[PDB]
Structures are given as C-alpha cells and as structure tokens.
Amino acid sequence: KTHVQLSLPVLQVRDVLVRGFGDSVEEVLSEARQHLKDGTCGLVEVEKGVLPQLEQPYVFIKRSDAAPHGHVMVELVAELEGIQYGRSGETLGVLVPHVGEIPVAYRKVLLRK
Secondary structure (H helix, E strand, O other): OOEEEEEEEEOOHHHOOOOOOOOOHHHHHHHHHHHHHHOOEEEEOOOOOOHHHOOOOEEEEEEOOOOHHHOEEEEEEEEEOOEEEOOOOOEEEEEEEOOOOOOOEEEEEEEEO
16 A cells, blocks of 8 residues: 555653664665554654754654545655755654653554555
8 A cells, every 4th residue: 555544652752762763864764664664663743852852864754635534644754964855744743763662642644655
C-alpha cells in the first residue's frame, strides 16, 4: 500500500533516550521509515526549546493533505543545518526512536510510504 495507518506515541522531549535516527539526511529518512514500519517510532511535538534538545539531522512529519478515519495524511521531510529535503505542509512533530518511553498521547496518521 502507498499509505499505512499508524498511531504514533507522543513522547515528552526530556524522556527521549535516543534523540535522533543517525548522521546523514539519507540515513535518518531510512531509519525513520524502518522504525515506522516496525512500530518503534515516537513523535515529539515541536515547541520553543524542543529541537535544540534533539540531534540533527531531524525527521519531521508534515501534513500532505487537508483526514481518512481520523488519520491526518503526512509525509517525511528531513532537515540538516537549516536545509529541508522534501517539501510539505505544516509540521505535526519530529520523529525519534521509541525504546519504551511512556507517551502522553497518540497521533493517528496516514503515512505516505
């Protein structure tokens, strides 16, 4: 399927144990997609002070359309030193590995895979 329904655990930035997916734009997009498929991907909602607490390159989920079955349609955009790879809508948050942190909420998304 071109799209996959996911419920992403929303983590508080200070709980996050593994603060990024790797060391290149291509690696972080690769690892993010693998974690999304394996159900080991968390979401941190972006506010003032969040991103400097995480590791670049960043992987964002961005709204790709204006919401089947409650799931917002999203796609992946990476960022490294202020340059984004991909073009999409509003940021829903930054993806991180999930290694058992307790979430505060779930974000239902339809991910363009």
